[PDB]
Design a protein around this ligand. Structure first.
Ligand code: LI
Ligand code: LI
Lengths: 237, 235, 228, 236, 234, 236
C-alpha cells in the first residue's frame, strides 16, 4: 500500500496473480486475507473473478473504494468477515488462496487445519488450494527477542521488534515507524508458522495432498535457503 | 563402552523407573532393545520386558547378557524389523522407544506407521513413550558441520554431519581418532520431528499426548531442552 | 515477576526472626514478605523512594512489618541489630560500581548476621547472559501501544554495563531509564565472599531452586558465615 | 557537537600533526573540510589549509568559526566538487580526505576521478592522504543492522543501516531519541573500497602507495584494524 | 570423489554457454584439467585448445582424448596462463572455469593473465571466467574447519586459513578413511571482489558485458556463491 | 619447534628483556621453564635463572642445552612440583610464569597458593610476573569446539576442546594429522581467571597489581587483547 521498500507488502502482486490465474480455469477464485487488493486487482486485470475475504473493516472499506474506481473493479467481490464463520453458500471455486502468511495468522495448528479444510470443501472437482508461507529453515529465526532494521527513508526509519518462541512456533512483533518529527507508529502482528512437513501433514488431515512447491510465485526451485514457499494442494482422491 | 558424551546417555536406571511406574504388573515392549541398557534395569524392578531388534547379532549379545544376568528371564528378545513383525494376541501396558529410536525410521510416514502399530499393541489404558532430540533446543546449523563429541587421554571423538532442514534428516559419522594413528568411522542417520509435528503424527496414529518432560526424572520441558520424553495414550 | 517467589525463598530461610533487604524498592519483595508474616528492614539511599514505600506501607494490611531504613549498603550503622537473613535481589549488589565496594557490602552483611544467618543475592550470570563486547540494542518486551527496548554499552574488562531501558509509545512519546552495573563472575563472587568471611552453601538459577548451569541467565546464591 | 562515539572521531590534533609532518610549510588541501575538525588544528600548527565542501551551508558555518578562531585566517574555504573543480595553477604539498570523505563519492568511477584530480593538484613529491574504513576489520554484516552508538543522560544515539556487500555501499540513519519524545534522523551513504581495490584505483589515477597505517599515530595496520590511513604519491 | 568433494557438475552447462559464444572458431580453456569442460565442448563440435602447466595432468588428458569419439577436437597445450607464446593463433573465446583465475596468487598476476587473454581474442571475441563470489561465500576471518562430504567409508573435510586483507585462501582438503588412512590435498587461491575484478579487467583492456550466477544464466546477486562474468575487448 | 601458530609464542627474547628490567643482581625464578625459551635469552643478559619443572624429560633436556650453551652456568634447573618444592633461604628479585603457566594449576585455590608461595620468595621490592590468556579478548565459545590451529605442506594442526565457562576450564587436544596417516594427540588443561578475579587472588596472596600490559613489549592492554602481562609486588 503506502510503506516503501522492504517495509511494504511483497512486490509480487503481479506474479501471484499470474500464478493463480494459470490455475483458475476461467472460473472464480477466493482470496483469504485480501487486504486492500494487492493480489485481487492484478487478478482482475487478467479477467479473473475474485471473491475476497477480509476481517479488517477499514481495509475492506478501502478495497471497496478502489474497486469502484478500478477499470476492472467489477471482477472483485469484497466479502467482509471471519472466514471460519462466513457462509459462502453453494458457491465453489477453482482456486482458494492465501498469500503472504495469511494462513499463519490463525494462532494454532488446529485452527489452520480447520481453515485448510473449509478451503477444501469450497473447491470444485480439480480445484486447488494455494498458500504462501514463511519457510522457517531458510528464514533462520533466532530464539527469543530480536530487533532489526526493516527499511530506511529520507525522513523515517522502519524497524521491527520481535519475540520468537521456537517451541510454540509463534512470532509476535511490532513493525515500528520513527519519524523526523518525533512521531512513532507501532503495528503489532502475530504468526504461528508451520514447517513444510508439518504443514503437509496438516493438509492430509484436512483432506488435501501436495501437488507442487516453489520458492515463490515465479516457480523458482524451493530449497533449504528459500525464505518462503508457495504450495499447491488438491483434494485427496 | 565409550566415555562421557561419546557413550549412550546415563539415564538407563531413570528410564526404567519411569517406564516401571507406568506398567501394571503387565509386560512392556521396548523398541530397539540394545544390549539392554534400559531393559536390564527394568528387570531389577521386577518388570517383564519384551525387546525388539532387527540385528540377529546384537540380539545375540543380549541373549548372552540375559544368561549371565540374575534376572535375565524377564528379558525376552524379539528378532525382526518392527514394521513387518507380527506379535499376534500379545498386548502391553507400555510401549517405549528410548534415545531417538523412533527417529531411526527415515520418514514421517514410517514414523506414523510405527506409532500406529504401537497403539494397536497397547491394552486399554496402556501408554506409548518416546525419548527424542528436541530440534528447537538442539540448535542445529543448516548444512554441514564438524564438532568435538568427547576427549579421552588417548583418543578424541568427533562428528562430521550433514543436516537437511527440509527433509529433517541428520546424516553423520561418529569419528574416533586414536594416538597410534587408528581411525574408526561410525555412520548413522536420523529423521527428527518437531514436537507439534510429532503430536499431529501421534493423533493421526490414534494417540494423544498426556505429558511431556525434558527427561526421565520429569524435569520441566522447555524450548532449550535438548530432549523430550513424551507420553501418549490411545484416543 | 518473582516477587512472591523471592519472598517465599527468603521466608523459608528467615524462621521467625527479622530480615534485612538491601535496595528495598517500592517493596516488591518486602510486602509479599510481610504478607508471609516476616519482618523486613529495608535499606535505601534515596529519601524519595523510601517515601513511596512509607505510603504503601500505611495502606497495607501488614505494612507495620516493613521497616524503612536510610543508609549505605557498604557503610551502615544499625547498631546491635542482627538478622537471620540479609538479601539483595535483582542485581542490587551489582549497583555498587566496584569489586571493593561489593566486598565491603558483603562484609557488612556478614557482620549483621546472627548465628546460622544467611546472606542471599540474586545476580545476572555473565556466561548465560551471553553478553557481546561493546554496544548492543535489543527488544525487552511488547505491549499493544508501546515497546520496551534496551540500548547498552558493555565493557568486559571493567565488567560494567551501562544501559538505557527505552519505552516507545504510539504517541511518539519516549521515556529513557538509565542504569549502571558492575557484575562479577560466580568464581569471582565466591572469592569476594570468602574475603568477606562468607562461604557459598547453595546456588540456584532462580528462587524456585531450579538447577543452575552455564546457560542460566541469573543465579540465586546463598552464603553463610565461613567455617572453622 | 555530540558526546562520545556519537560525535566525530577524536583524532583531529593527531591528523593535523600527521599532515603537517608531510606539509613542507607549503599549503594543504582538505577535501570534506566540514567544520574544521582537522583544518583548525592545522592552523594552530602554522599550516595554510584550503578546505573544500560541496554545500555552501557548511562552508558558512566554517566561515563563522574561522572568524572566531585565533588562527582562522589560515583556513581558506573553497566551494567545489571533489572530483571536478577549477583551482587553476595552485598546487599543494598534501591533499587529504579524512574520516571516510573519499567514500562519500558513491562509486568506483567517481573515486578514481577524485584521486586523479588530487594527483594533478600535487606539487613535486607531494602526497595524497586518505583515512578510510577497512571492511575486513569492520566485520560488516550483510543486509540490515541496528545498533547502539552512544548513550547520554537524556538521549540515546542509535544507528540503522543497510549494507550491500556487492555494490559495496552502506546506507544509514544516525538516530537520536530524546527523553522529550523527540526523534532526529541523520541520513548518510558510503561506497567503500577494499585496500587491494583502492591501491589499484590509485594506480589507475597515477598514484602509488608509499605507506599505510591504522591511524594518524602510525600504529601497525592489519586485518583487524577498523580503519587505515594511506599515503600516496604520484607514480614513476 | 563423491558429491561436493568432487568438481562442480556444470561441465555440460559450461560447454553450452561457451559454445553459444564460440561461433565456429576455436576456444582456449585456461586450466583445461582432464577435459571436464573441453570434452563436453568437443561433443558440440567446438575446437578446444586446453592449457595446463602440469605435464602429468596433460598426459592423462591425451589418453582420454585418444579414447574419446571426438578427442581430435581437444588440442592440449603446455604453458603458463600469464605468460606463453601461442604465435598468431587467435580465439573466439578464452575461458577459465571454477576459480582457475584465482589460482594465480596476486592481483598483478591476475591482471597479466587477463591482458594476455585479451591479446588472444579475435574481434568481438570474449573472455569468460567463473569465480567464487566473496560476498555470497560468507568467508569467516581466520582459520576454519568444516565437513565437505560424507561417504560410507570415508569423510571429506577441509581446514583453511583465510586472510581477508591479502584476499587469500589457503587450505587442505582432508580425506579420513576407515582403517587409518589420511590424505591431505593442499591448495591456495587469491580471490577478487567483482568491483575489483572489473577494474582489473579495465586495466587489462577488457570491459564487462554480462554477469550471471552460473552457466545457466541465473540472476547474479549478493547471495550467489559464484559468478560467471563475460568480458569484451575495450 | 612447531610451525607458525602451532609452535610456542615467538616472544621469548621480549619476555627476557622485560623480566631483566625488573630483575636486580639477584636471581629470578621461572616457573615452568620448559626448554629455556626465556631462561637462555635471560642468561645472555647475565641474569641468573632458577627454572622449575616437574617434567623430568624437559629438565633433562634443559640440562643438555645448558651444557652446550655459552651461558648455561646461569641457568639453574630445579626438578619437581612447585607446590611441594621447599626452596629454603633463597630469595628472588623476580618470580615469573610465562604463557599460561599459572593456569596449568587447575583451581582458583591452587593458583592463590602458588601466588602466595611466590610472594614469600620475593626479596623486598621484588616482583611476580605472569602472562595469561585474557578471556574477554579470546572470545571462547561455550561447550565443545573444533578448529584449525595451523597448516603445513604435509600436516595440519587442529584442536578439539571443551570449554566450561562456570568452572573456567579448558580441556583440549592439539591434534597433528600427517600425510602418511599419522595422528599425534597432545592433551592439555587450563583453568583461567579474569583480570579482576586474578587481582583479587593476588590480594589474597599478599600481592598488589603495579602494572598490566598486552604483551612483553608493553603494548596497551584492552578488551581485545588476547593475553596480558601482569606485574605484582608485595602489599605494604
Ligand atoms: Li487457468
Ligand atoms: Li594411521
Amino acid at each position: 500500500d503506502e510503506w516503501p521498500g522492504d517495509a511494504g507488502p511483497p512486490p509480487d502482486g503481479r506474479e501471484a496473480a499470474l500464478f493463480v490465474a494459470a490455475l483458475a480455469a476461467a472460473r472464480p477464485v477466493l482470496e483469504l486475507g485480501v487486504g486492500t487488493g494487492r493480489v485481487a486487482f492484478p487478478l482482475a486485470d487478467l479477467g479473473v473473478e475474485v471473491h475476497g475475504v477480509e476481517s479488517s473493516e477499514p481495509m475492506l472499506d478501502k478495497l471497496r473504494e478502489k474497486a469502484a474506481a478500478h477499470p476492472n473493479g467489477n471482477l472483485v467481490v469484497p466479502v467482509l468477515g471471519n472466514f471460519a464463520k462466513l457462509d459462502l453458500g453453494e458457491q465453489r471455486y477453482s482456486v482458494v488462496f492465501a498469500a503472504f502468511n495469511t494462513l499463519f495468522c490463525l494462532l494454532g495448528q488446529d485452527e489452520q487445519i480447520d481453515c485448510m479444510r473449509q478451503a477444501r470443501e469450497l473447491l470444485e472437482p480439480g480445484g486447488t488450494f494455494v498458500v504462501q508461507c514463511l519457510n522457517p529453515a531458510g528464514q533462520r529465526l533466532a530464539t527469543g527477542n530480536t530487533f532489526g532494521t526493516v527499511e530506511l527513508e529520507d525522513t523515517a526509519v522502519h524497524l521491527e521488534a520481535s519475540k520468537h518462541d521456537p517451541l510454540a512456533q509463534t512470532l509476535s512483533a511490532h513493525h515500528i515507524v520513527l519519524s523526523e518529527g518525533g512521531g512513532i507508529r507501532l503495528f503489532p502482528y502475530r504468526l504461528r508458522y508451520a514447517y513444510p512437513a508439518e504443514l503437509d501433514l496438516m493438509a492430509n488431515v484436512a483432506g488435501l495432498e501436495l501437488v507442487e512447491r516453489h520458492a515463490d510465485f515465479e516457480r523458482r526451485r524451493f530449497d533449504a535457503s528459500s525464505r518462503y514457499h508457495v504450495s499447491v494442494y488438491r483434494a485427496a482422491a
